[PDB]
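Q: I have 113 residues here and want to know how they pack in 3D. Can you give me a structure?
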Amino acid sequence: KTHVQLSLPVLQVRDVLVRGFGDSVEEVLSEARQHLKDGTCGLVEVEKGVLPQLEQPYVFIKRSDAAPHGHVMVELVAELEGIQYGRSGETLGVLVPHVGEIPVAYRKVLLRK
């Protein structure tokens, strides 16, 4: 399927144990997609002071359209030293590995895969 319904655990930035997906734009997009497929991907909501507490390159989920069955359609955009790889809508948050952190909420998304 071109899209997959996912429910992403929303993590507090100070709880996150693994603060990024790797060391290159291509690696972090690769790893983010693998973790999204494996159900091992968390979401951190972006506010003042969040991104400097995480590791670049960043992987964002961004709204790709204006929401089937409650799931917002999203796609992945990576960022490294202020350059983004991808073009999409509003940021819903930054993706990180999930390794058992307790979430504060869930974000229902339809991921363009």
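Q: Anything worth noting?
A: Residues 19 and 54 are 5 Å apart (CA to CA). The domain at 3-112 is CATH 2.30.30 (SH3 type barrels.).
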